[PDB]
Amino acid sequence: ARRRRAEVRQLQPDLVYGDVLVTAFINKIMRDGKKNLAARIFYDACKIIQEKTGQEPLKVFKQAVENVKPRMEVRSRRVGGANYQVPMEVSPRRQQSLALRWLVQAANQRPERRAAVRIAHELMDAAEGKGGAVKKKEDVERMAEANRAYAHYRW
Template identity: 45%
Template sequence: MRKSKPKKRIILPDPKFNDVLVTRFVNDLMRDGKKTVAFQIFYDALEIVGNRMKNEEISPLDIWKKSLENITPAVEVKSRRVGGATFQVPMEIRAERKTAISIKNLILFARKRSGKSMADKLAAEIQAAFNGEGGAFKKKEDTHRMAEANRAFAHFRF
């Protein structure tokens, strides 16, 4: 859209936790429009996380939120063409994109894991992200490392 920005869609909170972030996560987790299946996978994963991490005093939902927070990148690199050369320019990410990236990375690396069900794989990835390890956390670290390496080109931001 050239002239105007599209209207923001209103996302309804999920039925169990009454949280909009959960619905955003489930919408990205969903395949072929099967939202009830996606909700079931998410709730089962949180239940598995709750059973595995009984010694933690916080709820499974808070563990999930903390793990999302742990894998949220602050900067990313974007390609900028200046003259004949292409530079990887580090840029700060706006808040909505940060959450979108972290959600997508968590789901992507959960799908890549080996395990029986998607709920098991998601629970394992949530646990790994909470502890500061796993594929999604490594992706964030790599993104930050790349931005740090290309900090010299930060003046190409515009």
């Protein structure tokens, strides 16, 4: 976006919990435009959250998403002819986007058989502070703040 500021899209709230974040996670699960399939996957994963945890799956979901959100990332910058890994903070929208994308991608890296089990296990492990998504957050917050010497290249 060069001329305008590219205002953010407003998603429809969830048909079950009424949360737009749930709908965004559905969309990140969606594949080839199959909305009903992704909804089946996520709601069956929520049915897996209960009977495995006494907590409501909405709380576990939100807490996992909060545990995956990175505080600082590292972007590349061309200075003096060289390329440096400059650390800088992360806007909340990018935090949410990276969190949901990492959750889906780490869930599909699990050895679980079907997708609902993968998403449910990833959500639970991320809510309790482990899994591939938390590893991604730790790696990003390691790369960033591992190159603190470039903090003056913030821009």
